[PDB]
Structure 1
Amino acid sequence: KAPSLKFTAPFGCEIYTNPIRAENCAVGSIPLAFDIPDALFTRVSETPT
């Protein structure tokens, strides 16, 4: 049967069964976008100088 994919998968990818899935695969990057309303911003006059 040879060593399993779990042991041979690159990028330190860990393989788990039942809901077949890969975890902790350290490759690449992910862009993020944050639509935040202006209501949550705080004016400098309320913060210490």
Structure 2
Amino acid sequence: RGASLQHTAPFGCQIATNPVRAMNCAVGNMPISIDIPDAAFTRVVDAPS
């Protein structure tokens, strides 16, 4: 049977099957766009100086 992907996982992956999923695949740039609410944006009139 030999060493599997659980031992031989290159790229620093964390391969776990059933379902087949490489958790912690250390690669890429993850584009995340946060459309946040406007209520956090307190200006200089609101902010401490």
Q: Normalization by structure 1: what TM-score?
A: 0.70
Matching residue of 1:33: 33
Matching residue of 1:48: 48
Identity percentage over the alignment? 61
One-letter code of the match for 2:34? F
Q: Normalization by structure 2: what TM-score?
A: 0.70
Alpha carbon RMSD of aligned pairs, Å? Answer: 1.7
What residue ranges of structure 1 are gaps of 5+ in the alignment? none
The structure richer in helix per residue is 1
Name the count of aligned residue pairs.
Answer: 49
